[PDB]
From a paper:
pmcAmyloid formation of α-synuclein (α-syn) is a pathological feature of Parkinson’s disease (PD), multiple-system atrophy (MSA), and dementia with Lewy bodies. In its disease-associated, aggregated amyloid state, residues 37 through 97 adopt β-sheet structure, which overlaps with the lipid-binding domain.
Interestingly, the density map of cryo-EM three-dimensional (3D) reconstruction shows two asymmetrical protofilaments intertwining into a left-handed helix with the helical twist of −1.64° with a half pitch ∼52 nm, similar to our negative-stain TEM. A different number of residues was resolved for the two asymmetric protofilaments, comprising residues E46‒K96 and E61‒D98 for chains A and B, respectively. Chain A folds into a β-strand–rich architecture including the β-arch kernel (E57–T72) that is present in other full-length α-syn structures. Unlike chain A, the lack of density for N-terminal residues G41–K60 suggests conformational flexibility in this region for this protomer. An intermolecular salt bridge is formed by K80 in chain A and E83 in chain B, an interaction not observed in other structures. Additional hydrogen-bonding is found between the two Q62 residues.
Numbering used by the authors:
A (entry chain E), B (entry chain G), C (entry chain D), D (entry chain C), E (entry chain B), F (entry chain A): 46 to 96
G (entry chain L): 67 to 95
H (entry chain K), I (entry chain J), J (entry chain I), K (entry chain H), L (entry chain F): 61 to 98
Write the structure that this text describes.
Amino acid sequence: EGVVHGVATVAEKTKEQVTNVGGAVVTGVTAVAQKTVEGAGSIAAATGFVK
Amino acid sequence: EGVVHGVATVAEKTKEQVTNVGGAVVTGVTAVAQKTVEGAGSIAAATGFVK
Amino acid sequence: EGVVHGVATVAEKTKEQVTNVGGAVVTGVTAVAQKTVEGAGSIAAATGFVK
Amino acid sequence: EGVVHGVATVAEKTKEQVTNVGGAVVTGVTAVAQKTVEGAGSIAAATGFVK
Amino acid sequence: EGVVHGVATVAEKTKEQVTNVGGAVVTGVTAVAQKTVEGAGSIAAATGFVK
Amino acid sequence: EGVVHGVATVAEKTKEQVTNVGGAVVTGVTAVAQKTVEGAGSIAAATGFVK
Amino acid sequence: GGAVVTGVTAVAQKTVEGAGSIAAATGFV
Amino acid sequence: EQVTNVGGAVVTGVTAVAQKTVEGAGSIAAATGFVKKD
Amino acid sequence: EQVTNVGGAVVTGVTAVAQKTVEGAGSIAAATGFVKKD
Amino acid sequence: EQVTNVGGAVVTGVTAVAQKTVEGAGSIAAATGFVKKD
Amino acid sequence: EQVTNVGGAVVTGVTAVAQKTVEGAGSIAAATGFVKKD
Amino acid sequence: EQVTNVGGAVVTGVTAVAQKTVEGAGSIAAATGFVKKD
């Protein structure tokens, strides 16, 4: 049935070289954030700088 | 059935070298953020700078 | 049945070298955030800087 | 039946090396954050800087 | 039946080496955060900096 | 039947090496934070910095 | 070969579904 | 066969900031002060 | 067969920072003070 | 068959910091003070 | 067959902090002061 | 078959900390000052 409303991601990390010798690095494998609804309902959101 | 509303992604990371010497870098494998709806409903969102 | 509303992610870490000498590093495997509803309901959320 | 509303993640750690001499490193396998409702309910959540 | 509302996570640790000599390291396997309701219920959660 | 609302996580540790001489290390497997209500009830939780 | 940098500010960020503001400046004399 | 040889690697005074944010907000502000009088 | 060779690796005065945030907020601010009088 | 060779690895004075936050908030502020008179 | 070879590994004056937070709040503030007169 | 080879491994003055928080709050602040006059 695969994926209906969500998303699908596949990855294979065979060989990677990362040398951190002069700074800072951040890396990641597929972080996700999800807001979904099926029927009657309401998702109200304010994400960011709101003040 | 594959994908109905969301998207699909495949990425095989075979061989990669990144050299961090004169600064900083960020990268990752396909982060995603999703909002979808099936029937009657509402997603009311404001993302960014709102003030 | 796969995934209906959520998302699907697969990753394989075969060989990876990270050498952290000239600074700091952060990395992760698929952290997730999820808010969903099925029927008549309400998720109301404000995430970030609200003031 | 797989997963209905939540998300699905699989990872395999075959071989990974992290050496950290001149800084700090944080890493992890799939931390999760989830809020969900089924029927007549409500989730109200302000996460971040609220003031 | 798999998982209905929660999430699914599988990870295998074949071979990994963390060598940390001149800094601090933190790592872990799948810490989770969850708040869910089924029927007539409510969750109100302010997390972060609230003041 | 798996898990209805809770989450599912499996992990195997074949071989992992940690060495720490001049810093701090913390390692963990499946730390849990959960709150769940099914019928008539509620949960109010403010966690973090409240002042 | 040489890799000699005088003095540097370096900024990198990725944001998905939010907002981010970078503000950097260097002082060299 | 992928190889990298860093010969000198001499960077004197640096500020380096990286961040990743999903579903939120993050603002970063950095500044360097360098003076090589001689 | 991948190989990294770092010859010198000399970085004198540095501040470095990375962070990841999912479903929240995070602001970092850094600054360096360097003076090489000689 | 991957290999790392760090020849010198000399980083005089640094501050470094990383963090991951899921479902919360985290703000950091760092700064270095360096003076190499010579 | 992966191997790490650190030749020099010299970091004179450093401070480093890392944290992970799930469902909470955490703020860190670090600083260094180094003076190598010679 | 992975091996660890640390040749020099010299850290003069350091201060490092790490923490993990699940369902709570945790904030630390640390700093170092080193003076290598010579």
